Amino acid sequence: ASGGGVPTDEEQATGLEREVMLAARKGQDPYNILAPKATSGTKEDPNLVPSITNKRIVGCICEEDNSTVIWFWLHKGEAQRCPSCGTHYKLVPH
Amino acid sequence: HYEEGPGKNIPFSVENKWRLLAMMTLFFGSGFAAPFFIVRHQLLKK
Amino acid sequence: MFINRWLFSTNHKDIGTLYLLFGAWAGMVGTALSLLIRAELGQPGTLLGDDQIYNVVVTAHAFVMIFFMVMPIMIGGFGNWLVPLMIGAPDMAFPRMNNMSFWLLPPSFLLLLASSMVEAGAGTGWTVYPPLAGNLAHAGASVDLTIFSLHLAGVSSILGAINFITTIINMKPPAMSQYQTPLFVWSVMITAVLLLLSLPVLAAGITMLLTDRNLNTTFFDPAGGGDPILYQHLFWFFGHPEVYILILPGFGMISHIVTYYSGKKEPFGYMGMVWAMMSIGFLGFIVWAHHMFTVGMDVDTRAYFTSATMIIAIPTGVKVFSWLATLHGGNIKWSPAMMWALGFIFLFTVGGLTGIVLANSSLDIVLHDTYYVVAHFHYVLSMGAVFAIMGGFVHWFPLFSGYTLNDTWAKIHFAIMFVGVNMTFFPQHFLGLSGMPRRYSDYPDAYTMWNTISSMGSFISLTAVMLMVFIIWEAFASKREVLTVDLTTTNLEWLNGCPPPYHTFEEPTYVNLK
Amino acid sequence: HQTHAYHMVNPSPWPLTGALSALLMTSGLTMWFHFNSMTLLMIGLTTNMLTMYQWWRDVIRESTFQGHHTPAVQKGLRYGMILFIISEVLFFTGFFWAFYHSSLAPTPELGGCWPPTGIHPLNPLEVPLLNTSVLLASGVSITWAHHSLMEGDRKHMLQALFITITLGVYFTLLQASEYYEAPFTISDGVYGSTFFVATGFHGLHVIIGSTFLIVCFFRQLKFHFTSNHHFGFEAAAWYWHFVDVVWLFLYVSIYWWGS
Amino acid sequence: KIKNYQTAPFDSRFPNQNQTRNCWQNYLDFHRCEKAMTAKGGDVSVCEWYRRVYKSLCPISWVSTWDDRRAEGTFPGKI
Amino acid sequence: FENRVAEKQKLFQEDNGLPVHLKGGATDNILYRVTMTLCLGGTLYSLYCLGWASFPHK
Amino acid sequence: ITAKPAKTPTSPKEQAIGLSVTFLSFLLPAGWVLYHLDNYKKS
Amino acid sequence: MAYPMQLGFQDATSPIMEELLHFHDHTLMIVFLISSLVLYIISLMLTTKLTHTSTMDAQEVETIWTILPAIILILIALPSLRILYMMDEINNPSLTVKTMGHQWYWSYEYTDYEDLSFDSYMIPTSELKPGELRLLEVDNRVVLPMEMTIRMLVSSEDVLHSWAVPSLGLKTDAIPGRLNQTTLMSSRPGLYYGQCSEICGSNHSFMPIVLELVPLKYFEKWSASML
Amino acid sequence: ASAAKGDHGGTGARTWRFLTFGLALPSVALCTLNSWLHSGHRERPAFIPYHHLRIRTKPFSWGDGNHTFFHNPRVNPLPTGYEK
Ligand SMILES: CCCCCCCCCCCCCCCCCC(=O)OCC(COC(=O)CCCCCCCCCCCCCCCCC)OC(=O)CCCCCCCCCCCCCCCCC
Ligand code: HEA
Ligand code: HEA
Ligand SMILES: CCCCCC/C=C\CCCCCCCCCC(=O)O[C@H](COC(=O)CCCCCCCCCCCCCCC)COP(=O)(O)OC[C@@H](O)CO
Ligand SMILES: CCCCCCCCCCO[C@@H]1O[C@H](CO)[C@@H](O[C@H]2O[C@H](CO)[C@@H](O)[C@H](O)[C@H]2O)[C@H](O)[C@H]1O
Ligand SMILES: CCCCCCCCCCO[C@@H]1O[C@H](CO)[C@@H](O[C@H]2O[C@H](CO)[C@@H](O)[C@H](O)[C@H]2O)[C@H](O)[C@H]1O
Ligand SMILES: C[C@H](CCC(=O)O)[C@H]1CC[C@H]2[C@@H]3[C@H](O)C[C@@H]4C[C@H](O)CC[C@]4(C)[C@H]3C[C@H](O)[C@]12C
Ligand SMILES: C[C@H](CCC(=O)O)[C@H]1CC[C@H]2[C@@H]3[C@H](O)C[C@@H]4C[C@H](O)CC[C@]4(C)[C@H]3C[C@H](O)[C@]12C
Ligand SMILES: C[C@H](CCC(=O)O)[C@H]1CC[C@H]2[C@@H]3[C@H](O)C[C@@H]4C[C@H](O)CC[C@]4(C)[C@H]3C[C@H](O)[C@]12C
Ligand SMILES: C[C@H](CCC(=O)O)[C@H]1CC[C@H]2[C@@H]3[C@H](O)C[C@@H]4C[C@H](O)CC[C@]4(C)[C@H]3C[C@H](O)[C@]12C
Ligand code: CUA
Ligand SMILES: [O-][O-]
Ligand SMILES: [Cu+2]
Ligand SMILES: [Mg+2]
Ligand code: NA
Ligand code: NA
Ligand SMILES: [Zn+2]
């Protein structure tokens, strides 16, 4: 007797769960669930780092499989470089 | 919110160093004293 | 607000602070108990009473030092403070369950204290073997209070283990694989797996002891077809993983401290260090009967346990040589934390090597239940686990508090403690080789000289412990606030300042994949 | 405001009340065993149940009503439950080790044989076999309940979950009757010790698992679960399969092989 | 057949450190042999080897307890 | 039964600053006070019992 | 590490007080118990 | 027995104890060597202002410090296991003696021939005869024939104890309900001392073991007089 | 094993309900029948005061101290034998 009566997430998810679900449907990631994919990282094509404030910590895995992560604050303004490999990052506050 | 910063992220006051000395004295001293007084307690039974 | 913050916490840093305060208070209890031991033994004859009061002290000394000082400090204290910061996580996975892991410990400690106050205490050894710990030879509530103390400590650590494993697997930045997490984080994960698997077996065994004592079961009572040796297997199936639980977070802290004060961005041989900690964790589950070489075990079983135990030297040696290779070429900073870590490398190695002597079941026949075992494990615990705790405490005190220690006082403290622990325990090798048994309140006259020296050493360590308290007081009294910390690019836990805000990583780190 | 998906939990008193309930239950068992009194124990059991009720109440408020269980949070709870079950497996492993240690090497006090002289084991083909069919059947019905929930079928989810619970209750009532009818007791040497402590902890977990299923039943009646989000149901089903598998090991080891 | 008995010899059935079953088995064997002889008329002297072995190996208190329980009817081994 | 999850969502998301364990209303406060009173009074009683049991009683 | 000068400097005399108080808090209660041991045992 | 300021093992009284001494010398040399090498390398790493702080390749050197310790372990395990199995070999005893642990004393049974058994208690310090050893003498020693293979069987009638004689290399736990076997052979006459080696309560420190090794004919006459 | 049954294509509630009512509950019903046929008391054996049974190292914390928790007078003797 295949009937219904069970709510769906679309009907009943709420709060942050619902925000995450609705943004994923738009292909957006405001809650940082996905790893961002790097650009070439030049001064012309810096990695664009979104932030809700005017600084954010970056971790730079300089080469694939490095076990050491290089951590630094990225500030609003001119692009900064990773102190180990020089790849460029620029803050995009919003 | 809660207080942030040095001297504020702890459950004890460090505003006065001499009150702090008394508190730390009671705290660590009570731990160190307890086994001696339990030994005394057990000796004064049998 | 005070109750909300400190009794109702869901914050990994405040809960870490609670654990550090609890473990420091326990360390004073355990130190007092160690001084009572060495006062009893400091001259021939009887000081306190017969072996019952003496071995209640010995038993409480061990439980306090292991369950209430080392594990709360390393796992509850450094683990809660550092693990979420080192992976950029906003807290632990189960922040409210985390708080219950902490608050189970004061009741566990109260139960231990109760055990020693009622009747004649639990004079059993921390191994609590029956039938001495059973209801005829230890009638009354003391042993049952000890069992329940262990039950609560065990629940605390099992739920903490679930928390740490979940946090470390699930809450890293999405680009960070397990092979981009710091070695201290690895060390806590592996410790948590050992806790998860071993403590339930202890819990089963001590529950059987409880029912033999109170419900007329006979798991360990031959009159019912039980076997005292079964208890020993269940206990030591936990108890060997337990000593690796006691050292692994120490290994993790030592890796960070040696890397940092060598001026390096990374430890030498990272994947070998991960491999070595996992290998040690695994081999630590298949060697437990080296605690049982004199119980009447078949020769082939003795051969297996001898060989399996010795194999652990190979991954452990990789870690020791990797620490030395981390120093190699460093810009060495002779900080107090570095002194603790260098003392660790050497003295842990001495204690590991006497453990390899004991792994040889033929020699262990003569060395088992003598002070040679006591010497082995105090080199790895008093000069290993504790040296790593002191090194990490001095290194990260400015992060946790925002204030600096006086480094000269901290070097003085290290020097005193180093003399004290070595004077205490090095002569105990001679006492073991020459046949002095464990758990004795007095000894044949020939053993007097080394017992006298050993007890004098224990008083030097007391002076170091008292000076430690003053040094912490002086730091909070003077209020020198931290400004700049070097090497933040490879020590993420410092990058939010000192102390970090209550909430960190509300915005997570950006790590891309490429 | 956060831009990660994890749950910052409100400051909560239940960790402290839970820890104190543990103190009261253990000091209460001590008082009962040694000082002829149940007072502290009854207080501890009461505060333990109150703590569990309000804590898991709050988890429902945080998820169904407040939306804090994002996929990242749910994934953590999945790991949490799996690790919890692993710890419970190892707890039972200690009792199975005790059972095999004593039965593979029966001592002279037993007659040097297993089962011991004077022990008359239950027939594993009577109620023990029935109990086996009951838990196995409930593993089938809880799977039907799970599939009905994922397919959006409220009525058959409830029916299947009700049948699962009924079978859990049936097992518990059968086991209670078998305990009363058993001619051996927990004091009948290591045979009675291993039998009752191992099947006893198993029975406690059946009761725990049944209670968890009943919680899911009433949350389902109140429409808390969606067809895609229902981790409390999944966790109760995993725990239920764990209870079923421990039973099969007990049946083969203690009831059948050890008879 | 002929003595010169000094102590119980090595027994390949019981080669390890735990000799409990060696004591137990020779106790059983002695009393089983004894029972068999006393009935059919014959001589307990054929049981003598088991008697010497269990006496050599078995703690006095075990023998004493086992003897008491046989007299009581509570001995759990089969004789 | 009808689905009233929406009204519970409104109740527990109300912007009133209450922590989740008190956010249902006055019954939460009562059950909290009962729980905590039993726990603290029971803990004091356990300490009295320790005091009693720490000495011999003929 | 670098750090600010002490906000509330602890002079050598103040340290001598803090150190003496710390040591006495450990030594005096234990010393009292051990001094009176004979009294406890002989009871 | 141990003597004042003793550093190492008691002198060997049995061939197996002599094997243990040589094996311990072998192992201690390795322990000293590795400890000293680690201390020396620490000091080497710490005594230069030359630096090299860039990434160091680990693969090659980890072969060395895995293979060399594996070889060392094998060089320990080989003589270790040889003694283990030699210890275990069949020997054919001339005599069996039981000892039963109790709180707090040992009893002994010599029941190969007659029913001989007695208790053996520490001599109280206040009753030592001049020149006797505090905490070590007993009232009734375990008299045994020298130069003969003896089977000792060890059990307990209450809690765990452990029956130990360091100069013969002997330590066998005393477990109620269990009968543990060990073998004993003294190359020399004399008095050989040991102490209870499993915590057993109030007087654990005070239930010692004293073997008295004499020629067979003395042992036989002593045995007859103890009936 | 493939057991002996055999019905997939895209697993589902319908199949698991089929299994519940067509296999699982019938098996419970068969085992329930089997058990009700073989119930009925068995002769309680002669009492023998074996020392490895009816263990009492400490009185139980209920009752008179000498009765197990689910004591059944018909089949559970006391250390002194069956009750009157
Ligand atoms: C290693 C921990 C740090 C050191 C701690 C304290 C340092 C003290 C020196 C200690 C400095 C290291 C020298 C150790 C050997 C000294 C005693 C000896 O001759 O041992 C002999 C054996 C048994 O041998 C025998 O049967 C023959 C007896 C021969 C008698 C000759 C007369 C000797 C005169 C009396 C010596 C008094 C001993 C002093 C008593 C010392 C009281 C403290 O005993 C033993 O096995 C004891 C087993 C110890 C196992 C741990 C090994 C750790 C080695 C670390 C060294 C690294 C580099 C050193 C350099 C290390 C510098 C840090
Ligand atoms: C921190 C805690 C800790 C640690 C890490 C260890 C580590 C080891 N332990 Fe220890 N042990 C204890 C704490 C610990 N132990 C305790 C508390 C007891 C007693 C419990 C009780 O009875 O109360 C005990 C008891 C104990 C016994 C039982 C002895 C007896 O009771 O008779 C044995 C026997 O094998 C043993 C062996 C070892 C070995 C082989 C290691 C190895 O892991 C050590 C490996 C390390 C090294 C070998 C050094 C570094 C290596 C190199 C530089 C490489 C080259 C070396 C070689 C080639 C050899 N330990
Ligand atoms: C972590 C474990 C640990 C530690 C650190 C110690 C430390 C000490 N132990 Fe302990 N000991 C055991 C675990 C430990 N012990 C165990 C398991 C046993 C066997 C029990 C049994 O037989 O059943 C034992 C047995 C044992 C005996 C044998 C008793 C016997 O066989 O009769 C002796 C005798 O000398 C002894 C002495 C000492 C001494 C003098 C110290 C001193 O080194 C202590 C000196 C002080 C410290 C090490 C500081 C402690 C405090 C802190 C580190 C807190 C720091 C605060 C902050 C960081 C804020 N111990
Ligand atoms: C002798 C008698 C001794 C008796 C001692 C008793 C001691 C303790 C008293 C216990 C009181 C328990 C009260 C309820 C605790 C519920 C914990 C829970 O459910 O914890 C959950 C995590 O653990 C998970 O999932 C998975 C883990 C769930 C664990 C549930 C509780 C188990 C307690 C006993 C564990 C024993 C393990 C034994 C193995 C031997 C949730 O974590 P929180 O941080 O809360 O929330 C995070 C938010 O995002 C949720 O919205
Ligand atoms: C946190 C650590 C706690 C450790 C727990 C240890 C166990 C505690 C249970 C002890 O409780 C006590 O038991 C006594 C014996 O039952 C009671 O006295 C009762 O019995 C006495 C002796 O007959 C009489 O004097 C009194 O009338 C009567 O109150 C007493 O009131 C009660 O408090
Ligand atoms: C292992 C940890 C402990 C390590 C060693 C402790 C060092 C001792 C510090 C001094 O302790 C004090 O010593 C006094 C004696 O010097 C005692 O006074 C006692 O003796 C005095 C002198 O005879 C009398 O005036 C007092 O009334 C009488 O209490 C006093 O009670 C005790 O606090
Ligand atoms: C110690 C444990 C018995 C525990 C018990 O008495 O309860 C037994 C059970 C299975 C045994 C193992 C298995 O028999 C397999 C191996 C047999 C070899 O002869 C010795 C090592 C060997 C790896 C054994 C070591 C040890 O005796 C084990 C692990
Ligand atoms: C009330 C509810 C109707 C669904 C809805 O609320 O919309 C129905 C549907 C499923 C029903 C339950 C299930 O059919 C299973 C059970 C069947 C028993 O005969 C009665 C109780 C029993 C537990 C039912 C109670 C009640 O009638 C339920 C819960
Ligand atoms: C919030 C606080 C708990 C304090 C605590 O955590 O220490 C309060 C709130 C209500 C209080 C309880 C009751 O409502 C009132 C009881 C009588 C007194 O007013 C205080 C004790 C008393 C038994 C209280 C215990 C405790 O102090 C409670 C529970
Ligand atoms: C393959 C693995 C990880 C390599 C990586 O992906 O970075 C590495 C890390 C640690 C290595 C091991 C350790 O270096 C220790 C051993 C060293 C020996 O030279 C080979 C085997 C040896 C056991 C190594 C095998 C292998 O190369 C391991 C296991
Ligand atoms: Cu007997 Cu120790
Ligand atoms: O345990 O080593
Ligand atoms: Cu070990
Ligand atoms: Mg021992
Ligand atoms: Na003494
Ligand atoms: Na699902
Ligand atoms: Zn980079």
Coordinates of N, CA and C and ligand atoms in Angstrom, one line a residue, chain A residues 58-63 66 68-70 72 81-87 89, chain C residues 514, ligand 17:
Chain A
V58 N 45.0 31.7 5.5 CA 45.3 30.9 4.4 C 46.2 29.8 4.9
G59 N 46.0 28.5 4.5 CA 47.0 27.5 4.5 C 47.4 27.1 3.1
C60 N 48.7 27.1 2.9 CA 49.2 26.8 1.5 C 49.8 25.5 1.5
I61 N 49.3 24.5 0.8 CA 50.0 23.2 0.5 C 50.8 23.5 -0.8
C62 N 52.1 23.8 -0.6 CA 52.8 24.4 -1.7 C 52.9 23.5 -2.9
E63 N 53.2 22.2 -2.7 CA 53.3 21.2 -3.7 C 52.4 20.1 -3.3
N66 N 52.9 17.6 -0.1 CA 53.6 18.2 1.0 C 52.8 17.8 2.3
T68 N 53.7 19.4 5.1 CA 53.7 20.7 5.8 C 52.8 21.7 5.2
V69 N 51.8 22.3 6.0 CA 51.0 23.3 5.5 C 51.6 24.7 6.0
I70 N 51.6 25.7 5.1 CA 52.1 27.0 5.4 C 51.0 28.0 5.7
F72 N 49.2 31.6 7.1 CA 49.4 33.0 7.3 C 48.1 33.8 7.1
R81 N 51.8 36.9 -0.9 CA 52.4 35.7 -1.4 C 52.6 34.7 -0.3
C82 N 52.4 33.4 -0.6 CA 52.9 32.4 0.4 C 54.3 32.5 0.7
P83 N 54.7 32.6 2.0 CA 56.2 32.8 2.3 C 57.1 31.7 1.9
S84 N 56.5 30.5 1.6 CA 57.3 29.4 1.2 C 57.4 29.2 -0.4
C85 N 56.3 29.3 -1.1 CA 56.3 29.1 -2.5 C 56.0 30.3 -3.3
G86 N 55.6 31.4 -2.7 CA 55.3 32.6 -3.5 C 54.0 32.7 -4.2
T87 N 53.2 31.7 -4.1 CA 51.9 31.8 -4.9 C 51.1 32.8 -4.3
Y89 N 47.8 35.2 -3.4 CA 46.4 35.2 -2.8 C 45.9 36.6 -2.6
Chain C
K514 N 44.3 22.8 -5.7 CA 45.2 22.9 -6.9 C 44.9 21.8 -7.9
Ligands
ZN17 ZN 52.9 27.9 -0.6

